[PDB]
């Protein structure tokens, strides 16, 4: 804060008016100029095909299995359930040490499941064991804030985002700390690993998201296009874009190579915030779980609502499309999971 | 249906049976959230302790009081997890009038919360032992930091102690009626009816919520 703050505060801004100028220079189109002639997806409708009941408290997270069949639901009752979407069977019911859990993830191999909440610890569970039950494999402590999103990189490394303004990557075998991604100025809420699993994005409560290099360790770029907290994030299937779901009643998407905001996806009649987002199979449909007990389906190219997913009497907190894009697994605070089409 | 599928269905049925069994136990107890300031001494508010949670039962009904710790001074996102508790215990000590302004601003922020619009608060004014010895001498009065702390009704100690309660009830009834109501009490370090006051407040809270749920209020 010395003479290098009447100097290096402007020089901390010189690279902001010379970045927005660089940013606003490479913009010869908006999304709705080359996606105007494409006919709309129509009034996309989707009825519920399987209602996975059984939870008591409100649902906070839900992750799809890689096999497009199993899924794991996290609720504030201290229970973790692995489902069989085809038959609505309950494969497992894993009790939790901490009754407050806000994260859940499925390992890509299907051998593990992670959870974490206000305990500031990611507990990773072993599904397939010779013992015949589900027991903790590791107790990933060393993080101060409450966990907000866990995602499995491989069978041995996991990426977590917490409320202490730090995204941060572990190694399950050692349980120690490999890389700590810092730079956010607020509670990080969401996480979305890239399909190539060499980068990821995270949205905090500072109206900004940062694309991190998981291999290297530093933020490649920061994306500021909102005005409130970002409590939802999801990655485009092609790996070159992603969407931000914020609580300011709008959900923007960004392009990694363009380093800009493409569309807003906002409606005047919608006032409630967004909780979760996901692209279905090709990025044309952007599922978005809102706060007014609904989940709009957005034609991403046209920025028009294609359908609604009403059927939850409480706010929708979970939203996830399956690997083959055959169904959705929206879950809400009414302790009810639902599968659509 | 295959035999293996039949056995899987039976295993699932057992899973739901065991899950439902725990629901009765979860619903029997009552959930409380403890919060306040660092100097409030929230831990010694409940002198019988028996996320730092405690499990105390008075009149043979169990309460689980959760003291959130380690989190920063935001409470913006992890407070959107407790909108099912019976009440929130906001403990503030009145040992210093320099921080009572910050305390009442914090109470205004937490009372006028979108996710906490239908949940009530029980106000515990901790550390009433030294309020007398801070007002009996009068070497530093509340009117130094406030405009009109010059009228309220030892007599002097009580007239000094009811002004903060007047301010807090003014804040509470400023916005939000019926759904949630503050419960201003007076707690000491050596006071013994702290859990009793909590119980006597939450029974009335449950009564009010049942009145609204039967549509009688």
């Amino acid at each position, epitope marked *: 804060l010395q003479s290098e703050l009447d100097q290096l505060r402007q020089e901390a801004e010189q690279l902001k008016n010379q970045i927005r100028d660089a940013r606003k220079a490479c913009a010869d189109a908006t999304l709705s100029q080359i996606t105007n002639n494409i006919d709309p997806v129509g009034r996309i409708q989707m009825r519920t095909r399987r209602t996975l009941r059984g939870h008591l408290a409100k649902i906070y997270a839900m992750h799809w299995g890689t096999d497009s*069949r*199993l899924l794991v639901s996290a609720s504030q009752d201290g229970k973790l359930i692995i489902w*069989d979407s085809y*038959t609505t*069977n309950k*494969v*497992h019911a894993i009790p939790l040490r901490s009754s407050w859990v806000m994260t859940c993830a499925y390992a890509p191999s*299907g051998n593990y499941v992670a959870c974490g909440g206000l305990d500031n610890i990611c507990s990773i569970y072993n599904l*397939k064991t*010779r*013992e*015949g*039950n589900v027991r903790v494999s590791r107790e990933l402590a060393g993080h101060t804030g409450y966990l907000s999103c866990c995602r499995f990189l491989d069978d041995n490394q996991i990426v977590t985002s917490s409320g202490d303004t730090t995204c941060a990557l572990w190694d399950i075998e050692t349980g120690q700390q490999t890389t700590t991604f810092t730079g956010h100025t607020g509670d990080v809420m969401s996480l979305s690993l890239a399909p190539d699993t060499r980068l990821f994005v995270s949205g905090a409560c500072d109206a900004s998201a940062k694309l991190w290099d998981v291999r290297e360790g530093m933020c490649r770029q920061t994306f500021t296009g909102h005005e409130s907290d970002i409590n939802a994030i999801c990655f485009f299937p092609n790996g070159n874009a992603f969407a931000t779901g914020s609580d300011d009643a709008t959900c923007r998407l960004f392009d990694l190579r363009a380093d800009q905001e493409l569309m807003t996806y906002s409606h005047d009649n919608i006032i409630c915030g967004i909780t979760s987002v996901s692209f279905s199979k090709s990025g044309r449909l952007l599922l978005a779980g809102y706060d007014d007990f609904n989940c709009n389906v957005w034609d991403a190219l046209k920025a028009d609502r294609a359908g609604v997913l009403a059927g939850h009497d409480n706010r929708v907190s979970c939203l996830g499309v399956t690997d083959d894009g055959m169904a959705v697994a929206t879950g809400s605070w009414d302790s009810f999971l639902k599968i659509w089409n | 249906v*295959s*035999a*293996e*599928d*039949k*056995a*899987a269905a*039976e*295993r699932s049925k*057992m899973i739901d049976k065991n899950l439902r069994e725990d629901g009765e136990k979860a619903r029997r107890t009552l959930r409380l959230l403890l919060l306040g300031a660092d100097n409030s001494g929230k831990s010694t508010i409940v002198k019988q302790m028996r996320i730092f949670e405690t499990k105390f039962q008075v009149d043979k009904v169990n309460f689980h009081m959760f003291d959130v710790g380690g989190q920063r001074d935001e409470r913006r996102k992890w407070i959107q997890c407790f909108n099912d508790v019976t009440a929130i215990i906001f403990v503030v000590d009145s040992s210093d009038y320099n921080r009572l302004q910050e305390a009442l601003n914090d109470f205004k922020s937490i009372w006028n919360n979108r996710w906490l619009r239908t949940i009530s608060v029980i106000l515990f004014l901790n550390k009433q032992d030294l309020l007398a010895e801070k007002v009996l001498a009068g070497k530093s009065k509340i009117e130094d930091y406030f405009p009109e702390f010059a009228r309220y009704t030892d007599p002097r100690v009580t007239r000094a102690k009811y002004f903060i309660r007047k301010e807090f009830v003014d804040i509470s009834t400023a916005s939000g009626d019926g759904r949630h109501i503050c419960y201003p009490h007076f707690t000491c370090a050596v006071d013994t009816e702290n859990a009793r006051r909590i119980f006597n407040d939450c029974k009335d809270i449950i009564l009010q919520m049942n009145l609204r749920e039967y549509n009688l209020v």
Partner: single-chain antibody
Amino acid sequence: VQLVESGGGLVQPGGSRKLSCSASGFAFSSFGMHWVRQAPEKGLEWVAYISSGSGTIYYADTVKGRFTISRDDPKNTLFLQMTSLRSEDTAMYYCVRSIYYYGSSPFDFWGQGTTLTVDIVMTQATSSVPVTPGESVSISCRSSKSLLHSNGNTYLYWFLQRPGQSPQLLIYRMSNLASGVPDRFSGSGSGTAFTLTISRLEAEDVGVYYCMQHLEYPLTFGAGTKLEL
């Protein structure tokens, strides 16, 4: 994980015998236990079944009413009551653990069997093949009905029985593999006829394999395909 049972011996016909299994080292209450008999030199014949908890009991036809199955969860104990010791009762009985959820591997673990002396037909036409070590083998089994169920998985199980060893799981539910089983093992086939094509077999593979179905709960056993030289 360690399963054991005791109560063998010699029985004068017309008597009762309490055969009990002492499970240890796993979540007993979350496993559907079984019982599988084997005559001294004939082949395995599944006899009974108990589900997780105290659900369905699925005695075999040849012993229905004559044998009773019981379990004691909190002490981790399993039983097999026997009445009226018969001429064909002389066999070695095994207790095999299995769990049924999506992706689980039933019949994964077996206990060392105790000897107590006195209808989908599945045939393994070859009961003895001298297979040169190091090259390959193509053990085959066939059924009478199509094991391909509507959900898309055939319910054939393969096992291995070395001399002086309890049966061990092998490629199960057509082309799936169990834990502790080398990747060289493989097997595929259609309904009504299956194969066990192995790649680069080595020593410690000589034994009598078995082919059992799991579509209808009477679980018939194949003749066996024991190898040699």
